[PDB]
């Protein structure tokens, strides 16, 4: 069942903010690799003396890339006089986050009905406050609470093309319209040392209900309509687990993978694979000959032999459950450390029902099986 | 005149090493933007638990991109037991360099006859030692001395496709052969607060001879054959200077620009300009209508009206001196801060004579003039 126990009104995923060393180069790599458009900016050219922030958009998915300038530039500023466009930004936290964890997701942003209320309620139910609700230009309100490790859950809300006050639109010869068909964030997954408490903490302050060898135990938390999915993994050892390997290279808990829905996974993967070796993203090694042999018996009704074989061409993995089918594939790590990666997905069956077709639990032993 | 006063035998530029936050994304941006090939690597996959280093090559130009992993990975190592492939690497210095200056050049590497001797001699003539000569796998010897700010002059020497011991070749489906025609480093320029002492210091320890409004005073230091060019600028104020603007955003002295020679500047600029908005590098605003009108009188004999107008198409600036002509164009800053940039050049007239045609001093008042 889905209890619908949300403690405050949640709408949709709103954006993912990466904390980087140099925002410019990462966005520009991400843009070309993922087919994402340069749509907004906040930096020196827009009067921001604190941080450089660049927004990539594709359909409704928004990726934000941020880095700190020399503190010397804003040394005359105080919070009340700040030129930062994201009031929660902190030079030390960012440099500290980036030193300890490397390129990674700092904030999972969700749009809510009233972020002020979202923050209060959440903190009343045990959330660790990170940034208090700030009202920007009397139009947008943001707040932040701790999610897991140094990742924050960011609440955004609008009085109601615009990202945020202070961000300028790139509407231009500077924003080419790349688009490899990716459209929205499906899920955002965290790696933590202990699942239970992570779950109890997060479920405790949001009201998100459990949508709930491998080397992992996982659980999925979700909003009332199940359109915000926030899964969490923990490792398991002795008889290494790949979640532990993440925790060691990441220096503790963080965001593991960003599942990005595509309106056509075949075109998305043609386009992304054309660019792997030329500035884009590499993909995990393709499953076997045989794995494409066993899909013939199990996805039949979903997929004609033609649509199948072309999964074999693009290294797409398939899985299924009573509610539907799902097409997925995984990138290699996005940066230097073997930590955060990206998943490209498309769900068949089920607006459509959030979480349609599972998350590929099936694929594990059915890749395996083909070797 | 050129005195030929080198204190030790110098051969050619050998490589430029950038210190980055995340080496992976910068190399991958640089590769696509500049038409440079992924040729070698040293990282976790090659057994390097200390740093991730990725080599871009184009003709003879080598760009190296390096970043630190979590120190936790090599906590059991001591210098004698290190898995670093570049023995001079230091986790703190790198993170400290990167925090203070942001994306930038850490090392200007020159190949010498004997780096051990190069280091001793230089330190005997007043160089500030940075890293002592280390012999790698009984084949290559590197040493480092301070150049200016936190930039080091790196001496490399071979017992004699290989970069260095410990670097693996990417010879593969992983190293696509991009090539927009860039072939070698022409010059490497530093911005410092005071020109005199910088010059006296550097000229003092190398023996490099002086090959020697704007808002700057500059001087060019050069090797015996004048194939290694190491120019230095200082600012001038009151009656801001753009060198001062660099010094403020960079947090002091550093490397200003990398002049990259192309075997065909028109093809290099077609290819680079195709990619500006799609993961590549942006170029400074093109000079006027009129500037292309005045080239008609002054480059005539060098360039037919056809070859000229196509400078106007690509925003290429031209300049000249008795020894020859030179074609040049400048990128916008390569990273977040308005600091380091790249120059694309091609020299006509003058093997060819190092420094043929000047550095574009002429272009300054002749851009100006066209506005
Ligand atoms: C339940 C949840 C939402 C957290 N979830 N669980 C997985 C998942 C499944 C299996 C393994 Cl090993 C690891 C993960 Cl993270 C998961 C995956 O997106 C997933 C599915 C399959 C595989 S693969 C390529 O077959 O082995 C890898 C991953 Cl990472 C996911 O979302
Ligand atoms: C002598 C030396 C080797 C250091 N050198 N000097 C310049 C130079 C010339 C003029 C100004 Cl303003 C600044 C620099 Cl750095 C220089 C340039 O490569 C150069 C030439 C022209 C212009 S522009 C586009 O006309 O104004 C800008 C630059 Cl950055 C250069 O190498
Ligand atoms: Fe997933
Ligand atoms: Fe130059």
Curated annotation (Swiss-Prot), chains A, B:
Swiss-Prot/TrEMBL catalytic activity: 3-(4-hydroxyphenyl)pyruvate + O2 = homogentisate + CO2
GO BP field: L-phenylalanine catabolic process; tyrosine catabolic process
Pathway: Amino-acid degradation; L-phenylalanine degradation; acetoacetate and fumarate from L-phenylalanine: step 3/6; Cofactor biosynthesis; prenylquinone biosynthesis
Domain VOC: 12-158, 184-332
Xref: NCBIfam families: 4HPPD
Function: Catalyzes the conversion of 4-hydroxyphenylpyruvic acid to homogentisic acid, one of the steps in tyrosine catabolism.
Protein name in the entry: 4-hydroxyphenylpyruvate dioxygenase
UniProt organism field: Arabidopsis thaliana (Mouse-ear cress)
Gene (name only): HPD
């Amino acid at each position: 069942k889905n209890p619908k126990s949300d403690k405050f009104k949640v709408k949709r995923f709103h954006h993912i903010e990466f904390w980087c060393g140099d925002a410019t180069n990462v966005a520009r790599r991400f843009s070309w690799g993922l087919g994402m458009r340069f749509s907004a900016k906040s930096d020196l050219s827009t009067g921001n003396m604190v941080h450089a922030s660049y927004l990539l958009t594709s359909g409704d998915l928004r990726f934000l890339f941020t880095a700190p300038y020399s503190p010397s530039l804003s040394a005359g500023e105080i919070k009340p006089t700040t030129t930062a466009s994201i009031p929660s930004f902190d030079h030390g936290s960012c440099r500290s986050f980036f030193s300890s964890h490397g390129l990674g997701v700092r904030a999972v942003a969700i749009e809510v009905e009233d972020a002020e209320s979202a923050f209060s309620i959440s903190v009343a139910n045990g959330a660790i406050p990170s940034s208090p609700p700030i009202v920007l230009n009397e139009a947008v309100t943001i707040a932040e609470v701790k999610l897991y490790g140094d990742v924050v859950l960011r609440y955004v809300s609008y009085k109601a093309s615009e990202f945020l006050p202070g961000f300028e639109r790139v509407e231009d010869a500077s924003s080419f319209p790349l688009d490899y068909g990716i459209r929205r964030l499906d899920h955002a997954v965290g790696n933590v040392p202990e699942l239970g408490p992570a779950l109890t903490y997060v479920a405790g302050f949001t009201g998100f209900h459990q949508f709930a060898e491998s080397g992992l135990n996982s659980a999925v938390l979700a909003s009332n309509d199940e359109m915000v999915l926030l899964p969490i993994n923990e490792p398991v050892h002795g008889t290494k687990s790949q979640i532990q390997t993440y925790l060691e290279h990441n220096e503790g808990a963080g965001l593991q993978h960003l599942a990005l829905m595509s309106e056509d996974i075949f075109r998305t993967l043609r386009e992304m694979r054309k660019r792997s070796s030329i500035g884009g993203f590499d993909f995990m090694p393709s499953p076997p000959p045989t794995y494409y042999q066993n899909l013939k018996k199990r996805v039949g009704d979903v997929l004609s032999d033609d649509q199948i074989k072309e999964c074999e061409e693009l290294g797409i993995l398939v899985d299924r459950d009573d509610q539907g089918t799902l097409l997925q594939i995984f990138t290699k790590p996005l940066g230097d450390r073997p930590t955060i990666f990206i998943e490209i997905i498309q769900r068949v069956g089920c607006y459509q029902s959030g979480g349609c077709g599972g998350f590929g639990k099936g694929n594990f032993s059915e890749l395996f099986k083909s070797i």
